[PDB]
Amino acid sequence: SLTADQMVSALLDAEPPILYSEYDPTRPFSEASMMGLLTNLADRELVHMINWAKRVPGFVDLTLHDQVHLLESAWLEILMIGLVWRSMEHPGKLLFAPNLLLDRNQGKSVEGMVEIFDMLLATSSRFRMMNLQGEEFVCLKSIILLNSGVYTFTLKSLEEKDHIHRVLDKITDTLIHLMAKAGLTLQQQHQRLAQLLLILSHIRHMSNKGMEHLYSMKSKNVVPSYDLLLEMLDAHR
Protein backbone atom coordinates (compact mmCIF):
# COMPACT_ATOMS: atom_id res chain seq x y z
CA SER A 1 0.00 0.00 0.00
CA LEU A 2 3.09 2.18 0.29
CA THR A 3 3.71 5.01 -2.14
CA ALA A 4 7.11 5.25 -3.82
CA ASP A 5 8.08 8.04 -1.45
CA GLN A 6 6.96 5.99 1.55
CA MET A 7 8.97 3.03 0.28
CA VAL A 8 12.17 5.13 -0.04
CA SER A 9 11.71 6.65 3.39
CA ALA A 10 11.17 3.26 5.01
CA LEU A 11 14.24 1.73 3.39
CA LEU A 12 16.45 4.70 4.29
CA ASP A 13 15.22 4.60 7.90
CA ALA A 14 15.97 0.87 8.05
CA GLU A 15 19.65 1.23 7.05
CA PRO A 16 22.05 -0.60 9.40
CA PRO A 17 24.99 1.20 10.98
CA ILE A 18 28.55 1.16 9.72
CA LEU A 19 30.59 -0.98 12.12
CA TYR A 20 34.25 -0.72 13.11
CA SER A 21 37.11 -3.17 13.33
CA GLU A 22 38.83 -3.39 16.72
CA TYR A 23 41.14 -0.54 17.74
CA ASP A 24 44.58 -1.01 19.32
CA PRO A 25 47.53 1.25 18.48
CA THR A 26 49.85 -1.30 20.03
CA ARG A 27 48.95 -3.92 17.45
CA PRO A 28 50.04 -2.95 13.94
CA PHE A 29 47.91 -4.47 11.17
CA SER A 30 49.06 -7.98 10.23
CA GLU A 31 48.44 -9.99 7.08
CA ALA A 32 48.02 -13.02 9.26
CA SER A 33 45.19 -11.38 11.17
CA MET A 34 43.25 -10.18 8.20
CA MET A 35 40.74 -13.03 7.70
CA GLY A 36 40.03 -13.06 11.43
CA LEU A 37 39.14 -9.38 11.34
CA LEU A 38 36.99 -9.79 8.23
CA THR A 39 35.13 -12.73 9.72
CA ASN A 40 34.51 -10.79 12.93
CA LEU A 41 33.07 -7.86 10.96
CA ALA A 42 30.92 -10.05 8.71
CA ASP A 43 29.45 -11.88 11.67
CA ARG A 44 28.57 -8.63 13.41
CA GLU A 45 27.09 -7.16 10.23
CA LEU A 46 24.85 -10.23 9.88
CA VAL A 47 23.04 -9.45 13.13
CA HIS A 48 22.21 -5.95 11.94
CA MET A 49 21.23 -7.39 8.55
CA ILE A 50 18.48 -9.48 10.13
CA ASN A 51 17.11 -6.36 11.84
CA TRP A 52 17.22 -4.49 8.57
CA ALA A 53 15.46 -7.30 6.72
CA LYS A 54 12.53 -7.24 9.14
CA ARG A 55 12.07 -3.56 8.29
CA VAL A 56 11.98 -4.08 4.51
CA PRO A 57 8.32 -3.50 3.62
CA GLY A 58 6.58 -6.83 3.04
CA PHE A 59 9.33 -9.05 4.40
CA VAL A 60 7.76 -9.95 7.77
CA ASP A 61 4.49 -10.69 5.97
CA LEU A 62 6.21 -13.90 4.85
CA THR A 63 6.41 -17.08 6.89
CA LEU A 64 9.43 -17.32 9.16
CA HIS A 65 10.49 -20.38 7.13
CA ASP A 66 10.56 -18.33 3.92
CA GLN A 67 12.25 -15.37 5.63
CA VAL A 68 15.04 -17.75 6.59
CA HIS A 69 15.24 -19.12 3.05
CA LEU A 70 15.55 -15.65 1.57
CA LEU A 71 18.35 -14.69 3.96
CA GLU A 72 20.11 -18.03 3.40
CA SER A 73 20.18 -17.21 -0.30
CA ALA A 74 20.99 -13.51 -0.08
CA TRP A 75 23.22 -12.90 2.96
CA LEU A 76 26.59 -12.76 1.20
CA GLU A 77 25.19 -10.75 -1.74
CA ILE A 78 23.87 -8.25 0.81
CA LEU A 79 27.19 -8.09 2.66
CA MET A 80 28.93 -7.54 -0.65
CA ILE A 81 26.69 -4.79 -2.02
CA GLY A 82 27.00 -3.07 1.37
CA LEU A 83 30.78 -3.27 1.13
CA VAL A 84 30.82 -1.96 -2.44
CA TRP A 85 28.54 0.93 -1.45
CA ARG A 86 30.72 2.16 1.41
CA SER A 87 33.81 1.64 -0.79
CA MET A 88 32.42 3.70 -3.67
CA GLU A 89 34.16 6.97 -2.79
CA HIS A 90 37.53 5.28 -2.25
CA PRO A 91 39.07 4.27 -5.60
CA GLY A 92 41.25 1.16 -5.41
CA LYS A 93 40.21 0.25 -1.88
CA LEU A 94 37.65 -1.80 -0.02
CA LEU A 95 36.28 -0.11 3.08
CA PHE A 96 35.48 -3.15 5.18
CA ALA A 97 35.36 -0.69 8.06
CA PRO A 98 36.44 2.94 8.45
CA ASN A 99 39.56 1.60 10.19
CA LEU A 100 39.98 -1.36 7.84
CA LEU A 101 40.56 -0.02 4.34
CA LEU A 102 42.29 -2.63 2.19
CA ASP A 103 43.85 -2.70 -1.28
CA ARG A 104 44.32 -5.64 -3.66
CA ASN A 105 47.94 -6.11 -2.62
CA GLN A 106 46.84 -6.76 0.94
CA GLY A 107 44.30 -9.14 -0.58
CA LYS A 108 47.17 -11.17 -2.05
CA SER A 109 48.12 -12.35 1.45
CA VAL A 110 45.19 -14.78 1.52
CA GLU A 111 45.18 -17.50 -1.14
CA GLY A 112 42.40 -16.96 -3.66
CA MET A 113 41.38 -13.62 -2.15
CA VAL A 114 42.69 -11.19 -4.77
CA GLU A 115 40.31 -12.58 -7.42
CA ILE A 116 37.31 -11.71 -5.27
CA PHE A 117 38.80 -8.35 -4.24
CA ASP A 118 39.15 -7.46 -7.93
CA MET A 119 35.49 -8.23 -8.64
CA LEU A 120 34.39 -6.14 -5.67
CA LEU A 121 36.63 -3.23 -6.71
CA ALA A 122 35.21 -3.45 -10.25
CA THR A 123 31.68 -3.16 -8.82
CA SER A 124 32.75 -0.15 -6.76
CA SER A 125 34.10 1.45 -9.94
CA ARG A 126 30.82 0.73 -11.73
CA PHE A 127 28.85 2.39 -8.90
CA ARG A 128 31.14 5.38 -9.24
CA MET A 129 30.72 5.66 -13.01
CA MET A 130 26.93 5.49 -12.61
CA ASN A 131 26.96 7.95 -9.75
CA LEU A 132 24.79 5.56 -7.73
CA GLN A 133 22.57 7.39 -5.25
CA GLY A 134 21.80 6.19 -1.72
CA GLU A 135 18.09 5.98 -2.51
CA GLU A 136 18.90 3.71 -5.45
CA PHE A 137 21.26 1.58 -3.35
CA VAL A 138 18.68 0.75 -0.67
CA CYS A 139 16.25 -0.24 -3.42
CA LEU A 140 18.81 -2.59 -4.97
CA LYS A 141 19.69 -4.18 -1.63
CA SER A 142 16.00 -4.84 -0.92
CA ILE A 143 15.58 -6.39 -4.36
CA ILE A 144 18.44 -8.80 -3.60
CA LEU A 145 16.80 -9.83 -0.33
CA LEU A 146 13.46 -10.61 -1.98
CA ASN A 147 14.62 -11.98 -5.33
CA SER A 148 17.72 -14.10 -4.77
CA GLY A 149 16.00 -17.04 -3.08
CA VAL A 150 12.61 -16.88 -4.78
CA TYR A 151 13.44 -19.47 -7.50
CA THR A 152 14.66 -22.09 -5.05
CA PHE A 153 11.75 -22.46 -2.61
CA THR A 154 2.54 -25.64 -1.76
CA LEU A 155 -0.51 -23.40 -1.70
CA LYS A 156 1.12 -21.18 0.92
CA SER A 157 4.28 -21.06 -1.20
CA LEU A 158 2.35 -19.78 -4.21
CA GLU A 159 0.77 -17.05 -2.09
CA GLU A 160 4.24 -16.10 -0.81
CA LYS A 161 5.70 -15.90 -4.29
CA ASP A 162 2.85 -13.69 -5.52
CA HIS A 163 3.43 -11.36 -2.56
CA ILE A 164 7.18 -11.18 -3.22
CA HIS A 165 6.53 -10.34 -6.88
CA ARG A 166 4.13 -7.56 -5.92
CA VAL A 167 6.66 -6.03 -3.52
CA LEU A 168 9.41 -6.33 -6.13
CA ASP A 169 7.10 -4.53 -8.57
CA LYS A 170 6.61 -1.71 -6.06
CA ILE A 171 10.38 -1.36 -5.70
CA THR A 172 10.64 -1.09 -9.49
CA ASP A 173 8.02 1.66 -9.32
CA THR A 174 10.11 3.32 -6.62
CA LEU A 175 13.31 3.25 -8.66
CA ILE A 176 11.50 4.77 -11.63
CA HIS A 177 9.97 7.42 -9.35
CA LEU A 178 13.41 8.38 -8.02
CA MET A 179 14.88 8.71 -11.50
CA ALA A 180 11.88 10.72 -12.72
CA LYS A 181 12.39 13.08 -9.80
CA ALA A 182 16.08 13.34 -10.71
CA GLY A 183 14.93 14.81 -14.02
CA LEU A 184 15.87 11.87 -16.23
CA THR A 185 13.94 11.42 -19.47
CA LEU A 186 11.61 8.44 -19.79
CA GLN A 187 14.22 6.81 -22.04
CA GLN A 188 17.03 7.50 -19.57
CA GLN A 189 14.83 6.07 -16.82
CA HIS A 190 14.35 2.67 -18.45
CA GLN A 191 18.01 2.61 -19.49
CA ARG A 192 19.25 3.33 -15.97
CA LEU A 193 16.77 0.87 -14.45
CA ALA A 194 18.25 -1.78 -16.73
CA GLN A 195 21.84 -0.76 -15.94
CA LEU A 196 21.14 -1.01 -12.21
CA LEU A 197 19.44 -4.40 -12.34
CA LEU A 198 22.20 -5.88 -14.51
CA ILE A 199 24.66 -5.07 -11.71
CA LEU A 200 22.70 -7.53 -9.59
CA SER A 201 23.76 -10.31 -11.97
CA HIS A 202 27.38 -9.45 -11.16
CA ILE A 203 26.66 -9.30 -7.43
CA ARG A 204 25.15 -12.80 -7.67
CA HIS A 205 28.27 -13.94 -9.52
CA MET A 206 30.52 -12.51 -6.80
CA SER A 207 28.51 -14.19 -4.03
CA ASN A 208 28.82 -17.58 -5.69
CA LYS A 209 32.56 -17.18 -6.31
CA GLY A 210 32.95 -15.87 -2.76
CA MET A 211 31.05 -18.76 -1.24
CA GLU A 212 33.30 -21.19 -3.10
CA HIS A 213 36.32 -19.30 -1.77
CA LEU A 214 35.12 -19.26 1.85
CA TYR A 215 34.47 -23.02 1.73
CA SER A 216 37.99 -23.64 0.44
CA MET A 217 39.40 -22.20 3.67
CA LYS A 218 38.16 -25.21 5.65
CA SER A 219 36.94 -23.14 8.59
CA LYS A 220 34.33 -24.56 10.99
CA ASN A 221 31.43 -22.74 9.30
CA VAL A 222 30.77 -20.55 6.28
CA VAL A 223 27.03 -20.02 5.97
CA PRO A 224 24.75 -19.01 8.82
CA SER A 225 22.73 -22.10 9.71
CA TYR A 226 18.96 -22.33 9.33
CA ASP A 227 18.97 -22.63 13.12
CA LEU A 228 20.96 -19.44 13.55
CA LEU A 229 18.98 -17.34 11.08
CA LEU A 230 15.71 -18.58 12.55
CA GLU A 231 16.94 -17.77 16.06
CA MET A 232 17.82 -14.22 15.00
CA LEU A 233 14.62 -13.84 13.01
CA ASP A 234 12.33 -15.85 15.32
CA ALA A 235 12.05 -13.24 18.07
CA HIS A 236 9.64 -13.52 20.99
CA ARG A 237 7.05 -10.85 21.90
Ligand X SMILES: CC1=C(c2ccc(O)cc2)[C@H](c2ccc(OCCN3CC[C@H](C)C3)cc2)Oc2cc(O)ccc21
Judge whether 31 is annotated as a binding position: no
One residue of 42, 95, 102, 121 binding ligand X per CB under 6 A: 42
x-or-dash string of contact with its own copies, 200-219, rule CB under 8 A:
xxxxxx--xx--x-------
86: closest CA among 48, 138, 51, 37?
138
Judge whether 165 is annotated as a binding position: no
Q: How many residues does the chain have?
A: 237
Check if the beta carbon of residue 111 is closer than 8 Å to that of residue 117.
no
Q: Is 96 in the site for ligand X (CB under 6 A)?
A: yes
Residue 226 C-beta: closest distance to ligand X, Å: 12
Residue 9 binding result from its own copies, ligand X, none, given CB thresholds of 5 to 8 Å by partner type: none
Q: Is 83 in the site for ligand X (CB under 6 A)?
A: yes
Q: Which residues contact 2 (CB under 8 A, 6 or more apart)?
A: 10, 57, 170
Q: How far apart are CA 74 and CA 76, in angstroms?
A: 6
Residue 74 binding result from its own copies, ligand X, none, given CB thresholds of 5 to 8 Å by partner type: none
Q: How many CA atoms lie within 13 A of 152 on its CB side?
A: 12
203: closest CA among 137, 107, 131?
137
E strands along 78-228, which residues? 94-97, 100-102
Q: How far apart are CA 149 and CA 171, in angstroms?
A: 17
x-or-dash string of contact with its own copies, 95-134, rule CB under 8 A:
------------------------x--xx--x--------
Residue 116 binding result from ligand X, its own copies, none, given CB thresholds of 5 to 8 Å by partner type: ligand X
Tell me the binding residues. Answer: 45, 86, 213
Q: Give the residue ranges of the annotated binding site for 17beta-estradiol.
A: 45, 86, 213
Binding site for ligand X (CB under 6 A): 38-39, 41-43, 45-46, 79-80, 83, 96, 113, 116, 210, 213-214, 221-222, 224
